[PDB]
Design a protein around this ligand. Structure first.
Ligand SMILES: [Mg+2]
Ligand SMILES: [Zn+2]
Ligand SMILES: [Zn+2]
Ligand SMILES: [Zn+2]
Lengths: 419, 505, 52, 78, 115, 66, 258, 47
RNA sequence: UUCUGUCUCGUGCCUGGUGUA
């Protein structure tokens, strides 16, 4: 139960990790050199919190082991990479060191509510409350630590052209305007699967439960539902459109017989995806039915960013109505500028700028927090090489009148999530 | 004392500036579900007569017919045509429709203005839309909030709600005699930008903005500039919005204190000192000082002079005309608003380095016992006070230098001087330096044995060793001070979680 | 009543070429739940054709 | 020889429009010409403004006494 | 569940007038034209064309609520020329402008291909 | 899951370009030159192929419920 | 008072896009013409899909959606077809639709790419953009998976659903140099020159022009392959001309209807 | 007039399972079974 | 100067966990 972490060893002002280890480690596909050999060679060590009170720890060797006037000069360990202090949800945040810490916490909380393909065998699982995006995407700007989270293979969100502008007043007070045309094209479209489980039983000497199409000539207690939607099996068929108060499993319990069927939850309105029939531990018939429902993103749906920018869709406009740049680029989501100044999510802005360079350069940008080699000015110098304003602004034309709006709008790709 | 009530709905709230401040945009399904028993009477028997024929299926229809003997007839089952007949003493439970009075609540009902009554306007897309200015009363942002709608079920109750709890009647609160609804958030920024002295509009643009005044009398004002080209000033259009003949004097946020003493007292160089006479804006720029929820604000005068209806319109007009001009002006925030021109960065760095040297000198004096313990305080406490003073001076001075370097087009400044969102301290933290991170009022404690992290050396009372974040949010935080910033921010979350249970009791 | 629960195609008006099952039916109008959309519209029974 | 305030409290006005509207909904005769509106609340309001509502407010005092005030006797606020 | 079908932005219901004129009461010679089932595609061109008329004192439009399929163009002209004809003419000749553009674009296209 | 048919922002067809893009990347093209080869000039369209993850290739690993 | 005299000048014309410049027209007219290019220009797109059998890993609605987004070659049939809702025939007919069929089953060991080449069409003029380069991938199928469906393509326009939008990207722009100061730059020299800037590399923006209207509206209409890019512009003009002719009809009637 | 055809799990082979029958595959005896797609009309807008 | 339609509002609960403002 002692919680500990690996650290590099420092014997004099020098790491024990020399280039030969990195080279052998780089080849670990051919030769099976691995972490075990790194530990066995005595280059890495697991320090525990109680042991960490007596270790002198550098953060980065390349600066904290040279000197001008000696600060420590007796380091014993060195951090592998300081970004390893973050957890699973906190290390998908790009530029978390440019954000106010509560924003990082709120993103850690919302990163567990963002829809995406939650597992590759989702069509096999009869899970309750499953949500999968039509077209989830890899973030254009990633931390190097989300490679181990395998987020690149099972992502939860879509890179959207975010325009941080107060447009027509519905992108207001934490809400976001969305592009109806983008939605039509499947932007943030997801399918929601709900699963209903039901099992038959020997209630007793006198009463028994069985799956059968209830019939009014024999079943008492029937309701207004259309039982005819059921086939003689007594189970709804895959591919049948259902709605609130529709019977899903025609269970009847003998007394002539009482209608004990299970109905679709009120106001769900889905299509039966698949129906599986089997036996439970007790050897009685048991069936799990999964009903899919396509959820086109509408007004009121909560969308969040990787920086803590929760917001509901205030209104949706057609592409003809959205503001457009010198070319036909309209934003997919317009977010209120007043969300930034008080919450100080500058990492949001830096993401929106580097995602722009990422989409132009044709490379996924790196937003690992403590980089020191990635600062705003260098990104801007990159961005101005692609014929853009170095700070990311653009000249938007009003979608309703076609007249340029006197303020140049900050716009660029930002990885938005659907909660 | 608290029950579950019929005729109640709940939905995610979303913004809608085109609704009047006393209107709520309920979705179609809720309006189709909730009913109001309307007594049958000769004045309306025909309206209800056909309404009843429509049944429960079509939206502008009815759900039940309650006969005078109490026998309820369910219209969901399309009963025999003989039962559909209604006479004077019966009640028709028609569906909720436009104009119906509803009382709208957010569950942390902290004060009287948390359950204001609104007129319904049915709209598509499943959400309870409400006007922006009503955000402050309910404290209800639109990031996913939900609010309860209660539909009164009798005329005696609708009348009571309409005459006691209607939204415009709740503009001013007895809690502090000031307004609680004001021009807030985005439209305050837009109206500040719109009422500047250098805002000019063509005939083509004003004739379009006047389309959005409801109370406009229809006569275009003589433009403040006739030649070489007809030009209207922003204040000229805004005078059309101010209702009746109001008379107040307010001051804009950036008003110099030494301006009222020198010359240019009644003719301010910077266009501060809002002056509204005879219902016209003579000078000044509008911000939270004059349009916000503050005593003596312009909306406060409008409410005290004009009734609550003319002020209801004044609110809606400000929002609609200013948001319509915001499509021309536009407003944003981006990286260009955080960069500091590389001249102010030199000042920031020099100030922070000098402050660090001062803290080092104080530490040397303390270690040499040259530091005298001040009255009441101990030696260690006087040392902590000395260091906190030096680092507070550093942060404040760097922030102040950041303020003066911002261009007039900077969108942080536009959102701070308007008062809509943010403070100069946020600009300081974003641009110049974040500052000291405190937990329980003290610098970061020695969690390990005599040090804050394994990366520092024992007995290190320096700035970065105890939590002073010397970088800005634009430049990024060093990992040690990243963790210290996390420690400092955790206090806000803990206080938020524990305070609610103590204050609710 | 008569065609409740049958599969109907809408042959006229804005919803032309839509498939839905019937959930309510009066002498003049019927409520059709559409197979594609998550909605149940009221339509005039003269606009409906039965596919079964 | 009445001492209560000669003005109609917002509560009195509210409960009067509420009750009088309900009576109109039950077709008690209306005291003023309907130009043709039919919402009982709008009619009750019109009455009030014309000061024709046939209601007297029985105002109880803390000691147990009471004073009947015709709606036409006291002053409306709005 | 409450999504409006997309057709409601352009398909006419039973009873809907394509256009409804009402005189404005606050000033002489001013009408309110209410287009049903239309938006800014038609509102900006008519508003701008009305402004070229030297006899048009005021011309502009609003969408009373964006989810309401109704727009309001307001016109007010000199007393010697009714707003009705102001509208009529500004469309009478706007149609000509678009036809003139069609003819001129058609010739420029045939002139670009092998020319 | 599968490459989107059209770019969400503008509407350019990009559904016919994922296989081509994979072939270009099979050659030593840098993804920026690959995108230029496929004719994707606007960053909204480039975002589609740079950020797309082909999960349908994983979903096909499962035997079908024929 | 009367109509202004507009001009046109095509600078580039390809089978993918048109760059043209419009002179002597209002700011509103040039933007409304843009809006028509996006929303109000009819094209043929799949709007009805009967899925006979689908066992692929993609769901029935997923398939339907993707089929809806496939661009069809709509150049002569679209101006001749009647809107389905306006058509008098029950169900579908050639006068209001183009029938499509896709019956596919994977039996070979390798995975089958169900591209748009499998979308057979009842008409030779309306087909996915495959005339004369890879095809839109609809599904990937394993051994034993199948997809058999019937579909009908309807005449529609981008205001109802994005599927009927004939453009990939419309680049509307006017006044490249900031002569009218319709946009105010905090630092005009940080901004790259427009493609149409008649400006030397010395000065940043054109000197302020107080009395001046916007003319010379530069367009770059890029097609999605459905309509030829010049036919999109012609289709806008005929459709807007019809909208005004019909609106004047309704208006004139409403004047007499007093 | 269908004997109620089901699809096996690990086999993927159609088996006829009537009421009052234990769900067992005809071959290998797997207990998991799936109902085959409906024959009813399936039509989508493709939107 | 053989009959025959006759169907109309059913319902768990506790406890614990996670989540929303
Ligand atoms: Mg909130
Ligand atoms: Zn694109
Ligand atoms: Zn036809
Ligand atoms: Zn088997």
């Amino acid at each position: 139960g002692r919680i500990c972490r690996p650290l590099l060893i420092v014997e004099k002002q020098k790491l024990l990790l020399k280039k030969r280890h990195i080279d052998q480690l780089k080849e670990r596909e051919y030769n099976n050199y691995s972490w075990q050999d790194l530990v066995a060679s005595g280059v890495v060590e697991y320090i525990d919190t109680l042991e960490e009170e007596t270790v002198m720890l550098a953060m980065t060797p390349d600066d904290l082991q040279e000197k001008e006037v000696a600060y420590c000069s007796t380091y014993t360990h060195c951090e592998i990479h300081p970004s390893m202090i973050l957890g699973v949800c906190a290390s998908i945040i790009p530029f978390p060191d440019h954000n106010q810490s509560p924003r990082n916490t709120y993103q850690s909380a919302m990163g567990k509510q963002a829809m995406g393909v939650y597992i590759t065998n989702f069509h096999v699982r009869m899970d309750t409350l499953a949500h999968v995006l039509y077209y989830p995407q890899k973030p254009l700007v990633t931390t190097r630590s989300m490679e181990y989270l395998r987020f690149r293979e099972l992502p939860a969100g879509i890179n959207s052209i975010v325009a941080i502008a107060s447009y027509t007043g519905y992108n207001q007070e934490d809400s976001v305007i969305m592009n109806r045309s983008a939605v039509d094209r499947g932007f943030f479209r997801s399918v929601f699967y709900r699963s209903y489980k039901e099992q038959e039983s020997k209630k007793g000497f006198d009463q028994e439960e069985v799956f059968e199409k209830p019939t009014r000539e024999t079943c008492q207690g029937m309701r207004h539902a259309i039982y005819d939607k059921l086939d003689d099996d007594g189970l709804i068929a895959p591919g049948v459109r259902v709605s609130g108060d529709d019977v899903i499993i025609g269970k009847t319990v003998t007394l002539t017989k009482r209608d004990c069927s299970t109905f679709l939850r009120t106001s769900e309105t889905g299509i039966v995806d698949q129906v599986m029939v089997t036996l439970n531990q007790e050897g009685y018939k048991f069936c799990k039915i999964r009903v899919r429902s396509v959820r086109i993103p509408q007004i009121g749906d909560k969308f969040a960013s990787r920086h803590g920018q929760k917001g509901t869709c205030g209104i949706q406009y057609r592409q003809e109505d959205m503001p457009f740049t010198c070319e036909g680029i309209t934003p997919d989501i317009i977010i209120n500028p007043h969300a930034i100044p008080s919450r100080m999510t500058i990492g949001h802005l830096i993401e929106c700028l580097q995602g722009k360079v990422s989409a132009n350069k044709g490379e996924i940008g790196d937003a690992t927090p403590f980089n020191d080699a990635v600062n705003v000015q260098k990104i801007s110098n990159l961005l101005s090489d692609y014929g853009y304003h170095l700070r990311g602004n653009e000249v938007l034309y009003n979608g309703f009148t076609g007249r340029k709006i006197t303020s140049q709008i900050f716009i660029g790709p930002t990885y938005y999530q659907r909660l | 004392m608290g029950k579950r009530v019929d005729f109640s709905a709940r939905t995610v709230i979303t913004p809608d500036p085109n609704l009047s401040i006393d209107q709520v945009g309920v979705p179609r399904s809720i309006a189709a579900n909730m009913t109001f028993a309307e007594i049958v009477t000769p004045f309306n028997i025909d309206r209800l007569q056909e309404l009843v024929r429509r049944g429960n299926s079509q939206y502008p229809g009815a759900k039940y017919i309650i006969r005078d003997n109490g026998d309820r007839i369910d219209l969901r089952f399309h009963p025999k045509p003989s039962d559909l007949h209604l006479q004077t003493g019966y009640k028709v439970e028609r569906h909720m429709c436009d104009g119906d009075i509803v009382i709208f609540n957010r569950q942390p009902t902290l004060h009287k203005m948390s359950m204001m009554g609104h007129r319904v306007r049915i709209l598509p897309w499943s959400t309870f839309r409400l006007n922006l200015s009503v955000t402050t009363p309910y404290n209800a942002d639109f990031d996913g909030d939900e609010m309860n709608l209660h539909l009164p079920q009798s005329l005696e109750t609708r009348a009571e709600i309409q005459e006691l709890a209607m939204v415009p009647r709740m503009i001013v609160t007895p809690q502090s005699n000031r307004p609680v609804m004001g021009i807030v958030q985005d439209t305050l920024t837009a109206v500040r930008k719109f009422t500047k002295r250098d805002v000019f509009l063509e005939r083509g643009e004003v004739m379009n903005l006047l389309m959005f005044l409801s109370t406009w009398d229809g006569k275009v004002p003589q433009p403040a500039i006739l030649k070489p080209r007809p030009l209207w000033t922003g204040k000229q259009i805004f005078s059309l919005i101010i209702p009746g003949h109001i008379n107040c004097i307010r001051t804009h946020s950036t008003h110099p204190d030494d301006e009222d003493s020198g010359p240019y007292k009644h003719i301010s160089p910077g266009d501060t000192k809002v002056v509204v006479e005879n219902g016209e804006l003579i000078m000044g720029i509008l911000c939270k000082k004059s349009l916000g929820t503050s005593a003596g604000s312009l909306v406060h005068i409008s409410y005290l002079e004009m009734g609550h209806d003319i002020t209801r319109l004044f609110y809606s007009n400000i929002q609609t005309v200013i948001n319509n001009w915001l499509l021309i002006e536009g407003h944003t925030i981006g990286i260009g608003d955080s960069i500091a021109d590389s001249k102010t960065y030199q000042d920031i760095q020099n100030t922070i380095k000098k402050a660090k040297q001062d803290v080092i000198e104080v530490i040397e004096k303390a270690h040499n016992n040259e530091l005298e313990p001040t009255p009441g305080n101990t030696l260690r406490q006087t040392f902590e006070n000395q260091v906190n003073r030096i680092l507070n001076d550093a942060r404040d001075k760097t922030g102040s230098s950041a303020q003066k370097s911002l261009s007039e087009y900077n969108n942080f400044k536009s959102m701070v001087v308007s008062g809509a969102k943010g403070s100069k301290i946020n600009i300081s933290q974003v641009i110049a330096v974040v500052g000291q991170q405190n937990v329980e009022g003290k610098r970061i404690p020695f969690g390990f044995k005599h040090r804050t992290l394994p990366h520092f050396i024992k007995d290190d009372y320096g700035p970065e060793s105890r939590g002073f974040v010397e970088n800005s949010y634009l430049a990024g935080l060093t990992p040690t001070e990243f963790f210290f910033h996390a420690m400092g921010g955790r206090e806000g979350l803990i206080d938020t979680a524990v305070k609610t249970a103590e204050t609710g009791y | 009543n008569e065609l409740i629960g049958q599969t109907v195609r809408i042959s006229q008006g804005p919803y032309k070429g839509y498939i839905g099952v019937v959930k309510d039916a009066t002498e003049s109008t019927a409520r059709v739940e559409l197979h594609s959309t998550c909605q149940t519209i009221s339509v005039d029974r003269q606009r409906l054709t039965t596919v079964g | 020889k009445r001492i209560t305030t000669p003005y109609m409290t917002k509560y009195e006005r509210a409960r009067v429009l509420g009750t009088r509207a309900l009576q109109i909904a039950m077709c008690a005769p209306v005291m003023v010409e309907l130009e043709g509106e039919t919402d009982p609340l709008l009619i009750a309001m019109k009455e009030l403004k014309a000061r024709k509502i046939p209601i007297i407010i029985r105002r109880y005092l803390p000691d147990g006494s009471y004073e009947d005030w015709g709606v036409d006797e006291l002053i409306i606020s709005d | 569940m409450n999504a409006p079908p997309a057709f409601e932005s352009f398909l006419l219901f039973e009873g809907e007038k394509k256009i409804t004129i009402n005189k404005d009461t606050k000033v002489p010679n001013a009408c309110l034209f209410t287009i049903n089932k239309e938006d800014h595609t038609l509102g900006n061109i008519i508003k701008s064309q009305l402004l070229k008329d030297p006899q048009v004192l005021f011309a502009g439009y609003k969408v009373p609520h964006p989810l309401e399929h109704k727009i309001i163009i307001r016109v007010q002209t000199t007393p010697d020329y009714s707003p009705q004809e102001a509208f009529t003419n500004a469309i009478t000749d706007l149609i000509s402008e678009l036809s003139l553009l069609e003819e001129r674009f058609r010739v420029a296209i045939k002139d670009k291909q092998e020319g | 899951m599968i490459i989107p048919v059209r770019c969400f922002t503008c509407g350019k067809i990009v559904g016919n370009k994922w296989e081509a893009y994979l072939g270009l990347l099979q050659a030593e093209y840098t993804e920026g030159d690959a995108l230029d080869a496929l004719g994707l000039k606007r960053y909204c369209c480039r975002r589609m192929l740079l950020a797309h993850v082909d999960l349908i290739e994983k979903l096909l690993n499962y035997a079908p419920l024929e | 008072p009367y109509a202004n005299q507009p001009t046109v000048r095509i600078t580039e014309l390809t089978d993918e896009n048109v760059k043209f410049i419009i002179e002597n027209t209002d700011l509103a007219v040039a933007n409304s013409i843009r809006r028509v290019f996006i929303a109000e220009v009819p094209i043929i797109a799949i709007d009805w899909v009967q899925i006979d059998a689908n066992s692929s890993v993609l769901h029935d609605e997923f398939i339907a959606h993707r089929l809806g987004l496939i661009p069809l070659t709509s150049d002569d049939i679209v101006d001749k077809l009647q809107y389905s809702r306006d058509c008098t025939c029950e169900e579908f007919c050639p006068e209001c639709s183009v029938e499509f069929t896709l019956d596919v089953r994977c039996n070979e060991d390798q995975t089958r790419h169900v591209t748009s080449r499998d979308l057979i069409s009842n008409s030779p003029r309306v087909i996915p953009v495959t005339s004369r380069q890879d095809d839109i991938l609809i599904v990937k199928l394993r051994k034993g998976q199948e997809l058999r469906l019937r579909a009908y393509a309807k005449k529609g326009f981008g205001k109802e659903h994005a599927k009927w939008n004939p453009t990939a990207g419309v680049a509307f722009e006017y006044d490249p140099d900031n002569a009218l100061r319709h946009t105010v730059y905090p630092k005009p020299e940080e901004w790259p020159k427009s493609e149409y800037s008649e400006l030397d590399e010395d000065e940043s923006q054109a000197p302020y022009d107080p009395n001046g209207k916007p003319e010379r509206f530069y367009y770059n209409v890029e097609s999605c392959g459905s309509l030829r890019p010049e036919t999109i512009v012609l289709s806008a003009l005929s459709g807007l001309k019809k909208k005004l002719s019909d609106l004047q009809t309704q208006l004139s009637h409403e004047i007499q209807s007093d | 007039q269908q004997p109620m055809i089901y699809i096996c799990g690990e086999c993927h082979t159609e088996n006829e399972i009537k009421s009052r029958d234990p769900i067992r595959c005809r071959e290998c005896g797997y207990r998991i079974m799936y109902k085959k797609r409906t024959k009813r009309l399936v039509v989508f807008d493709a939107r």
